């Protein structure tokens, strides 16, 4: 009679239904809440506008695509319940919104790439509103690229007779020769180019961040900040970010050595920082002019690279080059045995806390020592940038693969097994595609929050 | 005989 039925069990449909609903509460709440939370306030503004556009897109995917497809595409497969305009309209909207979320994710990866990798070059100067026009153009491209779906999709009577009312389905009506063209184009524009961009860009971000020395945010913990002259651990005269000056007693030459203006014992914030910049600069410069400390510095990464600078900052190139064998092991990646060496009477266990903190950094190559404060900014930057690529590709890859085989697996391996597998596959793929628009609110608040670097 | 749903 109408043997175009699909035999996917009630239990898998309940499962998928559940999942879709969870995805729905999460996606809708997150997108809505973000777009109305950033309906209130450069250059992070630009990334805010990008986020706004993103959340809007995802929200519209959830509102327009989900309910109808949940009914007609996963529960009652035939006939098509919403008429021709229903059919073409649905598919056009689907297409438009997906182009939108893809182009947006890309554009955001591009903007972030610019901000982080070319801060002065790109970010501060070139990047500025109106990038509203960019988002506008994105939406326009979404619409125009979705235009084909209005001609390709349609209503067709596929019942055995081709006359019975219960066989009226929504399906590509044009010649199958063109269907391939259309969906291949869609595959490239909505997945391939974007996914390549996301991939390489975010990878470059991640590597740039992993290679950046968190040295400053590290010292601000250990060394603190006092903009009125004081006494340090061993009772010498210090100001600013632990900048020792005129260590000789007493309070007078200390105040004289306050250069550069008559400090009168007190300094301003921007002065304590500019002082701190010079100190950190003279440390690295001390590292790179010293024959014992340079090649060790060179071989290290970025964390244990900061760890050294800390020590050089605290004790000068002269003292740190006095740790001969520890250096020999650090250069040899003996993190284990070199940590034990430093922990020995190193005499620099006159301040054990600061020493313990530096050795468990050297040892682990991670920031576990420095509390849960945003010295973890870089690492989180990395992880978030990985999350982006993983999330996008995982969520959208199988979706596009399923669409390709609709028109390519075509002829003639279309068995019962394949016809079935196709629809279970469909469940899966739309589940992931809808997982995109619910994972990316929560994820992208984390990258929005992750701009303490700039 | 193939799927009708894209």
Task: Judge if A27 and A41 occupy the same domain.
Answer: yes
Task: Judge if A88 and A222 occupy the same domain.
Answer: no
Task: Judge if A264 and A343 occupy the same domain.
Answer: yes
Give the method used.
Answer: X-ray
Task: Judge if A398 and A325 occupy the same domain.
Answer: no
- SS3 category, A366: coil
Task: Judge if A375 and A273 occupy the same domain.
Answer: no
CB contact under 8 A, B4 and A423: no
Q: Among A370, A391, A419, where does a domain finish? A: A370
Q: State phi, psi for A243 to the nearest 5 degrees.
A: -85, 105
Task: Judge if A285 and A208 occupy the same domain.
Answer: no
d(CA A248, CA A236): 7
Task: Judge if A162 and A252 occupy the same domain.
Answer: no
Task: Judge if A387 and A347 occupy the same domain.
Answer: no
Give residue A399's domain range: 1-213+371-454
Residues 6+ apart with CB under 8 A from A447: A112, A384, A385, A388
Residues 6+ apart with CB under 8 A from A221: A370, A371, A373, A375
Q: Among A370, A405, A432, where does a domain finish? A: A370
A2, A3, A4, A71: which to substitute to probe chain B, counting the most B Cβ within 10 Å?
A4
Q: Which long-range contacts (CB under 8 A, 24 or more apart) does A38-46 make?
A: A42/A128, A42/A129, A43/A115, A43/A123, A43/A124, A43/A127, A43/A128, A43/A454, A44/A448, A44/A451, A44/A454, A45/A129, A46/A111, A46/A127, A46/A128, A46/A129, A46/A131
Chain A interface with B: residues with Cβ < 8 Å? 4, 73, 77-78, 91, 153, 156, 158, 169-172, 183, 403, 406, 410, 414, 419, 422-423, 426
Task: Judge if A189 and A240 occupy the same domain.
Answer: no
Q: Is A92 annotated as a binding residue?
A: no
**Euclidean distance between the first and the last CA atom of chain A, given in angstroms as a whole number:** 66
- Which of A335, A320, A259 shows the shortest CA–CA distance to A289? A320
Residues 6+ apart with CB under 8 A from A60: A93, A97, A100
- Answer whether A123's CB lies under 8 Å from A43's CB: yes
Q: What is the DSSP letter of A246?
A: -
Please report, for the domain that includes residue A412, its CATH number.
1.20.1070.10
Residue A316 to residues A236, A244, A275: CA-CA distances in angstroms?
15, 11, 16
Q: Which two tokens stand for residue A350?
A: 């006159």
CB contact under 8 A, B1 and A414: yes
Resolution in angstroms comes to 2.8
- Which of A360, A348, A349, A429 shows the shortest CA–CA distance to A395? A429
Q: Hey, which residues 1-6 in chain B have their CB within 8 Å of chain A? A: 1-6
d(CA A81, CA A450): 46
d(CA A310, CA A319): 12
Q: Is A191 annotated as a binding residue?
A: no
Count the neighbouring beta carbons within 10 Å of the beta carbon of residue A83. 12
**Euclidean distance between the first and the last CA atom of chain B, given in angstroms as a whole number:** 15
> Packing angle between helix A10-37 and helix A416-448, nearest 10 degrees?
20
Q: Which two tokens stand for residue A337?
A: 């045995």
Q: Is A313 annotated as a binding residue?
A: yes
Number of domains in chain A: 2
Q: Which of A58, A95, A217, A223 is catalytic?
A: A223
Please report, for the domain that includes residue A292, its CATH number.
1.10.530.40
Pairing of strands A168-172, A243-244: unpaired
- Answer whether A42's CB lies under 8 Å from A451's CB: no
Q: Among A370, A385, A402, where does a domain finish? A: A370
Per CB-CB distance under 8 Å, the chain A contacts of B1 are 4, 414, 419
> Packing angle between helix A83-117 and helix A44-60, nearest 10 degrees?
160
Task: Judge if A316 and A401 occupy the same domain.
Answer: no
Task: Judge if A198 and A299 occupy the same domain.
Answer: no
């Amino acid at each position: 009679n109408s043997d175009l039925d699909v035999n996917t069990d009630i239990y898998s449909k309940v499962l998928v239904t559940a999942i879709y609903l969870a995805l729905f509460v999460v996606g809708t709440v997150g997108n809505s809440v973000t777009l109305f939370t950033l309906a209130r306030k450069s250059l992070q503004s630009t990334v805010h506008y990008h986020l706004g556009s993103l959340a809007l897109s995802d929200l519209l995917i959830l509102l327009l695509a989900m309910p109808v497809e949940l009914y007609n595409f996963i529960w009652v497969h035939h006939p098509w319940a919403f008429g021709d305009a229903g059919c073409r309209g649905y598919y056009f909207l689907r297409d438009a919104c997906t182009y939108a979320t893809a182009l947006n994710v890309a554009s955001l990866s591009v903007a972030r790439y610019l901000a982080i990798c070319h801060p002065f070059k790109a970010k501060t100067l070139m990047s500025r509103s109106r990038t509203k026009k960019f988002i506008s153009a994105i939406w326009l491209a979404s619409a125009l690229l979705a235009i084909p779906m209005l001609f390709t999709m349609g209503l067709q009577n596929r019942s055995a007779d081709g006359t019975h009312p219960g066989g009226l389905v929504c399906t590509p009506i044009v010649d199958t020769a063109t269907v391939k063209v259309v969906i291949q184009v869609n595959t490239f524009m909505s997945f391939l180019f974007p996914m390549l961009v996301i991939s390489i860009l975010n990878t470059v971000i991640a590597n740039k961040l992993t290679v950046m020395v968190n040295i400053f945010e590290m010292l601000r913990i250990d060394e603190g900040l006092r903009l009125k002259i004081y006494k340090d651990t061993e009772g010498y005269y210090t100001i600013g970010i632990g900048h020792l000056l005129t260590k000789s007693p007493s309070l007078n030459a200390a105040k004289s050595e306050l250069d550069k203006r008559n400090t009168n014992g007190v300094i301003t914030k921007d002065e304590a920082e500019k002082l701190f910049n010079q100190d950190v600069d003279a440390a690295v410069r001390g590292i790179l002019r010293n024959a014992k400390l340079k090649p060790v510095y060179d071989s290290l990464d970025a964390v244990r690279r900061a760890a050294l600078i800390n020590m050089v900052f605290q004790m000068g190139e002269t003292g740190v080059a006095g740790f001969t064998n520890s250096l020999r092991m650090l250069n040899n990646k003996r993190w284990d045995e070199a940590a034990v060496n430093l922990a020995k009477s190193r005499w620099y266990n006159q301040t054990p806390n600061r020493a313990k903190r530096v050795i468990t950094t050297f040892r682990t190559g991670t920031w576990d020592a420095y509390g849960s404060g945003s010295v973890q900014a870089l690492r989180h930057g990395v992880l978030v940038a990985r999350a982006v690529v993983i999330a996008f590709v995982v969520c959208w890859l199988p979706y596009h693969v399923r669409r390709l085989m609709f028109c390519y697996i075509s002829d003639e391996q279309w068995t019962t097994f394949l016809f079935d597998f196709y629809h279970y596959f469909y469940m899966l793929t739309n589940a992931l595609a809808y997982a995109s628009s619910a994972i990316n609110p929560i994820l992208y608040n984390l990258v929005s929050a992750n701009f303490r670097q700039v | 005989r193939r799927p009708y749903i894209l």
